[PDB]
CSV table of C-alpha atoms and ligand atoms in Angstrom, one decimal:
chain,number,residue,atom,x,y,z
E,1,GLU,CA,112.3,111.2,29.6
E,2,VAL,CA,109.5,108.3,29.9
E,3,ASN,CA,107.2,108.8,32.8
E,4,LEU,CA,105.6,105.7,33.9
E,5,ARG,CA,103.2,105.1,36.8
E,6,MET,CA,102.9,101.6,38.5
E,7,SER,CA,100.4,100.4,41.2
E,8,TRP,CA,100.1,97.0,43.2
E,9,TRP,CA,98.6,95.9,46.5
E,10,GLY,CA,100.3,93.5,48.9
E,11,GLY,CA,102.0,93.4,52.7
E,12,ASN,CA,105.3,95.4,53.4
E,13,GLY,CA,107.3,92.5,52.6
E,14,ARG,CA,106.0,92.8,49.0
E,15,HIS,CA,106.4,96.7,48.8
E,16,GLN,CA,110.0,96.6,49.7
E,17,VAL,CA,111.1,93.7,47.1
E,18,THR,CA,109.0,95.7,44.4
E,19,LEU,CA,110.7,99.1,45.2
E,20,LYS,CA,114.0,97.5,45.4
E,21,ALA,CA,113.4,96.2,42.0
E,22,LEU,CA,112.2,99.5,40.4
E,23,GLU,CA,115.5,101.1,41.9
E,24,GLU,CA,117.5,98.8,39.4
E,25,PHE,CA,114.9,99.1,36.6
E,26,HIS,CA,115.4,102.6,36.7
E,27,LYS,CA,119.4,102.0,37.1
E,28,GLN,CA,119.1,99.9,34.0
E,29,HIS,CA,117.0,102.6,32.4
E,30,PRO,CA,118.0,106.2,33.1
E,31,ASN,CA,115.5,107.5,31.0
E,32,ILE,CA,112.6,105.8,32.5
E,33,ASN,CA,111.0,107.1,35.6
E,34,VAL,CA,108.3,105.2,37.4
E,35,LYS,CA,106.1,106.5,40.1
E,36,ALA,CA,105.0,103.5,42.6
E,37,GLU,CA,101.4,103.5,44.0
E,38,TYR,CA,101.0,100.7,46.4
E,39,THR,CA,98.4,99.9,49.2
E,40,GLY,CA,97.4,96.9,50.9
E,41,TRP,CA,94.4,94.8,49.4
E,42,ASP,CA,91.9,97.3,51.4
E,43,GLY,CA,90.3,99.7,49.0
E,44,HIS,CA,92.6,98.9,46.3
E,45,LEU,CA,89.9,98.0,43.6
E,46,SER,CA,87.9,100.7,44.9
E,47,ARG,CA,90.5,103.3,44.1
E,48,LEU,CA,91.3,101.9,40.7
E,49,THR,CA,87.8,101.8,39.9
E,50,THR,CA,87.3,105.4,40.4
E,51,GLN,CA,90.7,106.0,38.4
E,52,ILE,CA,89.4,103.6,35.5
E,53,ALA,CA,86.5,105.6,35.3
E,54,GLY,CA,87.9,108.8,34.9
E,55,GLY,CA,90.8,107.4,32.6
E,56,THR,CA,93.4,108.1,35.0
E,57,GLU,CA,94.8,104.6,35.6
E,58,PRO,CA,98.4,103.9,35.5
E,59,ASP,CA,100.5,102.5,32.9
E,60,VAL,CA,101.4,99.4,34.5
E,61,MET,CA,98.9,97.7,37.1
E,62,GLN,CA,98.9,94.9,39.1
E,63,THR,CA,95.3,93.4,38.7
E,64,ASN,CA,93.1,90.6,40.0
E,65,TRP,CA,91.7,87.6,37.9
E,66,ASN,CA,88.0,88.8,39.1
E,67,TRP,CA,88.2,92.0,37.6
E,68,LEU,CA,88.3,91.2,34.1
E,69,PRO,CA,84.6,91.1,33.7
E,70,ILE,CA,84.6,94.3,35.6
E,71,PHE,CA,86.7,96.3,33.6
E,72,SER,CA,87.3,94.2,30.3
E,73,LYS,CA,84.0,92.3,29.4
E,74,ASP,CA,85.3,92.5,25.7
E,75,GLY,CA,88.9,92.2,26.4
E,76,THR,CA,89.6,95.8,25.4
E,77,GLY,CA,89.6,97.4,29.2
E,78,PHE,CA,93.5,96.8,29.4
E,79,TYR,CA,96.0,97.3,26.4
E,80,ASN,CA,96.5,93.9,24.4
E,81,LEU,CA,99.8,92.3,25.8
E,82,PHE,CA,99.7,90.6,22.1
E,83,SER,CA,100.6,94.1,20.6
E,84,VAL,CA,104.0,94.3,22.8
E,85,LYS,CA,105.5,90.8,22.6
E,86,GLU,CA,108.5,92.5,21.2
E,87,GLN,CA,109.6,94.2,24.7
E,88,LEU,CA,107.7,91.2,26.7
E,89,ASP,CA,108.5,87.5,26.5
E,90,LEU,CA,105.4,85.8,26.0
E,91,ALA,CA,106.9,82.3,25.7
E,92,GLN,CA,107.7,82.1,29.3
E,93,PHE,CA,104.4,81.6,30.2
E,94,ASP,CA,101.9,78.8,29.7
E,95,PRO,CA,99.6,78.9,26.7
E,96,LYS,CA,97.0,77.5,29.2
E,97,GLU,CA,97.8,80.1,31.8
E,98,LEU,CA,97.7,82.5,29.5
E,99,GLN,CA,94.2,81.8,28.5
E,100,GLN,CA,92.9,82.5,31.6
E,101,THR,CA,94.2,85.9,31.6
E,102,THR,CA,92.8,86.8,27.7
E,103,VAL,CA,89.3,87.9,26.8
E,104,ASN,CA,88.2,87.9,23.1
E,105,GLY,CA,91.5,87.0,21.7
E,106,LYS,CA,92.9,89.8,23.5
E,107,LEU,CA,95.7,89.1,26.1
E,108,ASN,CA,94.6,91.2,29.2
E,109,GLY,CA,97.4,90.4,31.8
E,110,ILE,CA,100.5,88.1,32.4
E,111,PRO,CA,99.6,85.9,35.5
E,112,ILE,CA,102.2,86.0,37.9
E,113,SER,CA,101.6,82.7,39.7
E,114,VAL,CA,98.6,80.4,40.5
E,115,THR,CA,96.8,79.8,43.8
E,116,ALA,CA,94.6,78.2,45.5
E,117,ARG,CA,92.9,78.9,49.2
E,118,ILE,CA,94.6,76.2,51.7
E,119,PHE,CA,94.7,75.7,55.5
E,120,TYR,CA,97.9,77.4,57.1
E,121,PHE,CA,97.7,76.3,61.2
E,122,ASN,CA,99.9,78.1,63.7
E,123,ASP,CA,102.2,75.3,64.9
E,124,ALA,CA,102.8,76.7,68.6
E,125,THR,CA,99.2,77.3,69.4
E,126,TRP,CA,98.0,73.5,67.9
E,127,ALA,CA,101.2,72.0,70.0
E,128,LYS,CA,99.7,73.6,72.9
E,129,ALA,CA,96.2,72.1,72.2
E,130,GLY,CA,97.9,69.0,71.7
E,131,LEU,CA,95.7,68.4,68.5
E,132,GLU,CA,96.6,67.2,65.0
E,133,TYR,CA,95.6,69.1,62.3
E,134,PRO,CA,92.0,68.1,61.1
E,135,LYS,CA,92.2,65.9,58.1
E,136,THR,CA,88.6,65.7,57.8
E,137,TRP,CA,85.7,68.4,58.1
E,138,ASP,CA,84.4,66.8,61.0
E,139,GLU,CA,87.6,67.2,62.8
E,140,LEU,CA,87.8,70.8,61.7
E,141,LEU,CA,84.4,71.5,63.2
E,142,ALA,CA,85.3,69.5,66.4
E,143,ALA,CA,88.6,71.2,66.8
E,144,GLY,CA,87.2,74.3,68.0
E,145,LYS,CA,85.5,72.7,71.4
E,146,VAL,CA,89.0,71.4,72.3
E,147,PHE,CA,90.5,74.9,71.7
E,148,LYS,CA,87.8,76.8,74.1
E,149,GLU,CA,88.1,74.0,76.5
E,150,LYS,CA,91.9,73.0,76.5
E,151,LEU,CA,92.9,76.6,76.3
E,152,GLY,CA,90.3,79.2,76.6
E,153,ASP,CA,87.0,80.9,75.1
E,154,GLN,CA,89.8,83.2,73.3
E,155,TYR,CA,91.6,80.5,71.2
E,156,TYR,CA,90.3,79.5,67.9
E,157,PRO,CA,91.5,76.9,65.6
E,158,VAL,CA,91.4,79.6,62.8
E,159,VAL,CA,90.3,82.9,61.9
E,160,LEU,CA,88.0,83.5,58.8
E,161,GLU,CA,87.2,86.8,57.2
E,162,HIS,CA,83.8,86.6,55.2
E,163,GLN,CA,85.6,86.0,51.9
E,164,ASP,CA,87.7,83.2,53.5
E,165,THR,CA,84.5,81.5,54.9
E,166,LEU,CA,82.9,82.2,51.6
E,167,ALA,CA,85.4,79.9,49.4
E,168,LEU,CA,85.4,77.5,52.4
E,169,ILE,CA,81.8,76.7,52.6
E,170,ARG,CA,81.8,76.7,48.5
E,171,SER,CA,84.7,74.0,48.9
E,172,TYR,CA,82.9,71.8,51.0
E,173,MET,CA,79.5,72.2,48.9
E,174,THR,CA,81.5,71.2,45.5
E,175,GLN,CA,83.0,68.2,47.4
E,176,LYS,CA,79.5,67.4,48.3
E,177,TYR,CA,77.4,67.7,45.0
E,178,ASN,CA,80.2,68.1,42.7
E,179,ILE,CA,78.4,71.2,40.8
E,180,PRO,CA,79.7,74.8,39.8
E,181,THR,CA,78.5,77.2,42.4
E,182,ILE,CA,77.1,79.6,39.6
E,183,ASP,CA,75.2,78.7,36.4
E,184,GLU,CA,77.2,81.1,33.9
E,185,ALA,CA,74.1,80.2,31.1
E,186,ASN,CA,71.6,81.7,33.4
E,187,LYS,CA,73.2,84.3,35.0
E,188,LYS,CA,72.6,82.9,38.7
E,189,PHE,CA,73.6,80.7,41.4
E,190,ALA,CA,73.2,77.1,40.8
E,191,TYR,CA,72.3,75.9,44.3
E,192,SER,CA,69.0,75.3,45.4
E,193,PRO,CA,66.8,77.1,48.5
E,194,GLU,CA,67.8,74.0,50.5
E,195,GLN,CA,71.7,73.9,49.6
E,196,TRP,CA,71.5,77.6,50.4
E,197,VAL,CA,70.1,76.9,53.9
E,198,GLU,CA,72.7,74.1,54.2
E,199,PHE,CA,75.7,76.2,53.4
E,200,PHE,CA,74.7,79.2,56.0
E,201,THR,CA,73.6,76.3,58.4
E,202,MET,CA,77.4,75.3,58.0
E,203,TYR,CA,78.7,78.7,58.9
E,204,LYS,CA,76.4,78.8,61.8
E,205,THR,CA,77.7,75.3,62.9
E,206,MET,CA,81.3,76.6,62.9
E,207,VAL,CA,80.5,79.5,64.6
E,208,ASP,CA,78.5,77.7,67.4
E,209,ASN,CA,81.4,75.2,67.5
E,210,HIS,CA,84.2,77.8,68.2
E,211,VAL,CA,86.0,77.0,64.9
E,212,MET,CA,86.4,80.6,64.4
E,213,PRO,CA,85.3,83.8,65.5
E,214,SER,CA,81.9,85.2,64.5
E,215,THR,CA,81.6,88.5,63.0
E,216,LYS,CA,80.7,89.9,66.4
E,217,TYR,CA,83.6,88.6,68.4
E,218,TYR,CA,86.2,89.7,65.5
E,219,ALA,CA,84.7,93.3,65.1
E,220,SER,CA,85.2,94.0,69.3
E,221,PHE,CA,89.0,94.2,68.3
E,222,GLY,CA,88.7,97.3,66.0
E,223,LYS,CA,89.1,97.3,62.5
E,224,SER,CA,92.7,96.5,61.7
E,225,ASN,CA,94.0,93.9,58.9
E,226,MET,CA,93.5,90.4,60.1
E,227,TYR,CA,97.5,89.9,60.2
E,228,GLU,CA,97.8,92.9,62.5
E,229,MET,CA,95.6,91.8,65.0
E,230,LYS,CA,96.7,90.9,68.3
E,231,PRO,CA,94.9,87.4,68.4
E,232,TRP,CA,96.6,86.6,65.1
E,233,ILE,CA,100.1,87.9,66.4
E,234,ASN,CA,99.5,86.3,69.8
E,235,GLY,CA,99.0,83.1,68.2
E,236,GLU,CA,95.4,82.9,69.8
E,237,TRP,CA,93.7,82.7,66.2
E,238,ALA,CA,95.7,79.8,65.3
E,239,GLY,CA,95.4,79.2,61.5
E,240,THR,CA,93.8,80.5,58.3
E,241,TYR,CA,92.3,79.4,54.9
E,242,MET,CA,94.6,81.5,52.4
E,243,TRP,CA,96.2,82.0,49.2
E,244,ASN,CA,99.8,80.5,49.0
E,245,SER,CA,100.8,83.4,46.9
E,246,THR,CA,100.7,85.8,50.1
E,247,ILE,CA,101.0,83.6,52.7
E,248,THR,CA,103.9,85.4,54.3
E,249,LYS,CA,101.7,88.5,54.9
E,250,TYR,CA,100.5,86.5,57.5
E,251,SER,CA,103.5,84.3,58.9
E,252,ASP,CA,105.9,87.4,58.8
E,253,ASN,CA,103.5,88.6,61.8
E,254,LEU,CA,103.7,85.5,64.1
E,255,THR,CA,105.8,85.3,67.3
E,256,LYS,CA,109.0,83.6,67.1
E,257,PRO,CA,109.1,80.4,67.3
E,258,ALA,CA,105.6,80.2,65.8
E,259,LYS,CA,105.6,79.1,62.4
E,260,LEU,CA,102.6,78.9,60.0
E,261,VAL,CA,102.4,75.5,58.7
E,262,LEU,CA,100.6,73.7,55.8
E,263,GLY,CA,97.9,71.8,57.4
E,264,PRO,CA,96.0,68.7,55.3
E,265,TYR,CA,93.2,69.6,53.0
E,266,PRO,CA,89.7,68.2,54.3
E,267,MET,CA,88.1,66.2,51.7
E,268,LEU,CA,84.8,64.4,51.9
E,269,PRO,CA,84.6,60.6,51.5
E,270,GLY,CA,83.4,59.9,47.6
E,271,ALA,CA,84.1,63.4,46.5
E,272,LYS,CA,85.1,63.8,43.0
E,273,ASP,CA,86.4,67.2,43.5
E,274,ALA,CA,88.3,69.0,46.0
E,275,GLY,CA,86.3,72.4,45.4
E,276,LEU,CA,89.2,74.4,45.1
E,277,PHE,CA,89.1,78.2,44.3
E,278,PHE,CA,92.5,77.8,42.1
E,279,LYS,CA,93.2,80.8,39.6
E,280,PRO,CA,95.8,83.3,38.6
E,281,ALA,CA,97.1,85.0,41.7
E,282,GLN,CA,97.5,88.1,40.3
E,283,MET,CA,98.4,89.9,36.7
E,284,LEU,CA,100.6,92.5,35.4
E,285,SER,CA,98.6,94.6,32.9
E,286,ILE,CA,99.2,97.5,30.9
E,287,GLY,CA,96.6,100.7,30.7
E,288,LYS,CA,94.4,100.9,27.7
E,289,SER,CA,95.6,104.1,26.6
E,290,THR,CA,99.0,104.5,27.8
E,291,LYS,CA,101.3,106.7,26.0
E,292,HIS,CA,104.1,104.4,26.7
E,293,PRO,CA,102.9,100.7,25.9
E,294,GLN,CA,106.6,99.7,25.0
E,295,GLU,CA,108.3,101.0,28.1
E,296,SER,CA,105.2,99.8,30.0
E,297,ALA,CA,106.1,95.8,28.4
E,298,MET,CA,109.9,96.7,29.5
E,299,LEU,CA,108.9,97.1,32.8
E,300,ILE,CA,106.6,93.9,33.1
E,301,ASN,CA,109.2,92.1,31.3
E,302,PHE,CA,111.8,93.1,33.7
E,303,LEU,CA,109.9,92.5,37.0
E,304,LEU,CA,108.8,88.6,35.8
E,305,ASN,CA,111.8,87.5,33.6
E,306,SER,CA,114.9,89.4,34.1
E,307,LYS,CA,117.7,87.9,36.3
E,308,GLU,CA,117.6,91.1,38.2
E,309,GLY,CA,113.9,91.5,38.6
E,310,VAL,CA,113.3,88.1,39.3
E,311,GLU,CA,116.0,87.8,42.0
E,312,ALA,CA,114.3,91.1,43.4
E,313,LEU,CA,110.9,90.0,43.5
E,314,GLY,CA,111.8,86.4,45.2
E,315,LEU,CA,108.4,84.7,46.0
E,316,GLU,CA,106.2,87.7,47.3
E,317,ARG,CA,103.8,87.0,45.0
E,318,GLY,CA,104.1,82.9,45.1
E,319,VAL,CA,106.1,80.8,42.7
E,320,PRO,CA,106.5,82.3,39.5
E,321,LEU,CA,104.8,81.1,35.9
E,322,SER,CA,107.6,82.5,34.0
E,323,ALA,CA,109.5,79.4,33.0
E,324,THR,CA,112.9,81.4,33.3
E,325,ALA,CA,112.1,82.9,36.6
E,326,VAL,CA,110.7,79.8,38.5
E,327,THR,CA,114.0,77.8,37.3
E,328,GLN,CA,116.1,80.6,38.3
E,329,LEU,CA,114.7,80.7,41.9
E,330,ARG,CA,114.9,76.9,42.1
E,331,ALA,CA,118.5,77.2,41.3
E,332,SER,CA,119.3,79.9,44.0
E,333,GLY,CA,117.6,78.0,46.4
E,334,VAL,CA,114.6,80.1,47.0
E,335,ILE,CA,112.2,77.6,45.8
E,336,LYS,CA,112.3,74.9,48.4
E,337,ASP,CA,110.2,71.5,48.5
E,338,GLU,CA,109.2,72.4,52.1
E,339,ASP,CA,108.5,75.9,52.0
E,340,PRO,CA,104.7,76.1,52.9
E,341,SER,CA,104.0,78.4,49.9
E,342,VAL,CA,105.4,76.1,47.7
E,343,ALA,CA,104.5,72.9,49.5
E,344,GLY,CA,100.6,74.3,49.9
E,345,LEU,CA,100.5,74.6,46.2
E,346,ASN,CA,101.9,71.0,45.1
E,347,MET,CA,99.7,69.4,47.6
E,348,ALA,CA,96.8,71.5,46.1
E,349,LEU,CA,97.5,70.5,42.7
E,350,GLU,CA,97.6,66.6,43.7
E,351,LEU,CA,94.1,67.3,45.1
E,352,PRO,CA,91.4,66.1,42.2
E,353,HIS,CA,90.2,69.8,41.1
E,354,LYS,CA,88.5,69.6,37.5
E,355,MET,CA,85.9,72.3,38.7
E,356,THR,CA,86.7,75.8,37.5
E,357,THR,CA,85.3,78.9,39.6
E,358,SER,CA,83.6,81.5,37.6
E,359,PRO,CA,84.9,84.9,38.1
E,360,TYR,CA,81.7,85.9,39.2
E,361,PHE,CA,81.7,84.0,42.5
E,362,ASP,CA,84.4,86.3,43.3
E,363,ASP,CA,82.4,89.7,42.5
E,364,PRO,CA,83.0,92.1,45.0
E,365,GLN,CA,79.3,93.1,45.4
E,366,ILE,CA,78.8,89.2,46.2
E,367,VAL,CA,81.6,89.2,48.7
E,368,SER,CA,80.2,91.9,50.7
E,369,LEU,CA,76.6,90.4,50.3
E,370,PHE,CA,78.2,87.5,51.9
E,371,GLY,CA,79.9,89.3,55.1
E,372,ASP,CA,76.4,91.2,55.3
E,373,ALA,CA,74.7,87.9,55.5
E,374,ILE,CA,76.8,86.2,58.1
E,375,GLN,CA,76.3,89.1,60.0
E,376,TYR,CA,72.9,89.1,60.2
E,377,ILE,CA,72.9,85.8,61.6
E,378,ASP,CA,75.7,86.6,64.1
E,379,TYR,CA,73.7,89.7,65.3
E,380,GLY,CA,70.6,88.1,66.0
E,381,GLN,CA,68.9,89.8,63.1
E,382,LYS,CA,68.0,87.4,60.5
E,383,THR,CA,67.6,83.7,61.1
E,384,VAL,CA,69.5,80.8,59.2
E,385,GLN,CA,66.7,80.4,56.9
E,386,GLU,CA,66.0,83.9,56.4
E,387,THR,CA,69.6,84.7,55.5
E,388,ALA,CA,69.9,81.8,52.9
E,389,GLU,CA,66.4,83.3,51.0
E,390,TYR,CA,68.1,86.9,51.0
E,391,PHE,CA,71.5,85.8,49.9
E,392,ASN,CA,70.1,83.7,47.2
E,393,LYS,CA,67.6,86.4,46.1
E,394,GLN,CA,70.0,89.6,46.2
E,395,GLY,CA,72.8,87.5,45.2
E,396,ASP,CA,71.2,86.7,42.1
E,397,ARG,CA,70.3,90.3,41.2
E,398,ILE,CA,74.0,91.3,41.5
E,399,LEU,CA,74.8,88.6,39.1
E,400,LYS,CA,72.4,90.1,36.6
E,401,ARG,CA,74.1,93.3,37.2
E,402,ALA,CA,77.4,91.5,37.1
E,403,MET,CA,77.0,89.4,34.1
E,404,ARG,CA,75.7,92.5,31.9
I,501,LIG,O1,98.9,87.2,46.7
I,501,LIG,C1,97.8,88.3,46.6
I,501,LIG,O2,98.1,89.4,47.3
I,501,LIG,C2,96.3,87.9,46.3
I,501,LIG,C3,95.9,86.7,45.7
I,501,LIG,C4,94.3,86.7,45.5
I,501,LIG,O3,94.5,85.9,44.1
I,501,LIG,C5,93.8,87.9,45.3
I,501,LIG,O4,92.4,87.8,45.3
I,501,LIG,C6,94.2,89.0,46.4
I,501,LIG,O5,93.3,88.2,47.3
I,501,LIG,C7,93.2,89.3,48.2
I,501,LIG,C8,94.2,89.6,49.7
I,501,LIG,O6,95.4,90.3,48.8
I,501,LIG,C9,94.3,88.5,50.8
I,501,LIG,O7,95.4,88.8,51.7
I,501,LIG,C10,93.1,87.7,50.9
I,501,LIG,O8,92.5,88.5,51.9
I,501,LIG,O9,92.4,87.8,49.9
I,501,LIG,C11,92.2,88.8,49.2
I,501,LIG,C12,90.9,88.2,48.2
I,501,LIG,O10,90.4,89.2,47.5
I,501,LIG,O11,91.0,87.0,47.9
I,501,LIG,O12,95.5,89.1,46.5
């Protein structure tokens, strides 16, 4: 009798396939029981942080790439997956993808898929507005006015949650200035005071120009998860800047015959870098002090490499990085070139994208700092310049506490 716990986050679609997959794993292993612990994205890091701090975390965990500096600054925060290469077939995963999940020579997670945020639009609402998807940043910004005038105050080209908006304006600044957002050497942000004014100026331009809801309007709806909101479902918020690895958590909730559809990626003329946030979409990791490292490794192998786990898990986490698994899905017809999830990624890789994102750009204190920031602008409390100075200063402080 081996009892394991496994945690993950996701939409219900992803819960349903994972639960299906675990039922098979247990069928194939009468002696290995897994308790499942699963939520949506919200509060999930927060809960696992409490567990890790009291040493009660699961044997198997779905982890995020930006959590490596949080839990595993020295690579010892999770079990070294090189120690279970007997159970877990490592050679299926690219050596260069494995390097992103390796810290101090210790393999901390198996990246499941890679992802970048890209534009996805409600094709139904865009057809009503009689617009083509923006091919440029100017078109992005000019599209809100058309939405509001052709369809009404209630229609937006996109909805952006603050984290979405952070990634977007950084993409714009990267395209423009071709520098990293974080100076990792000096433990701080790389942008000048001016560049930060320009960053929050752009937010406010987009908000003024009716591109997406302001934070104030977004909060007149209730708290709900974005994909469960009426204006998302009703097709009133007509798009998202979103990971291809979890796009169906969004599209599953549109009203037929509306589809979320790949849009073009805006690029400034002369840009030497598309400014993607491209990374492991997520990982499977083993608890540092698991009493069952081998059975855990068997479970991770099953879900990522076995015929039956691969078939069960389908594309709820994106296009598998496992050679065997992505080949299976292609052969079964599950990966198709025209799938917006698949096409999202392919279009993205062809974008020039040499700039890597620092895991610190996605520090949860920095992300919350950013939502706070644009809330001050939207609720009249801080001007654009004050907000830019406030972000620069307080975010630098977090980066020193984060980069410790
Ligand atoms: O596929 C996912 O569930 C996923 C891929 C991203 O790499 C992760 O950072 C994580 O993103 C979460 C959330 O699930 C997603 O809906 C979006 O809101 O952004 C979140 C984020 O932290 O970026 O999940």
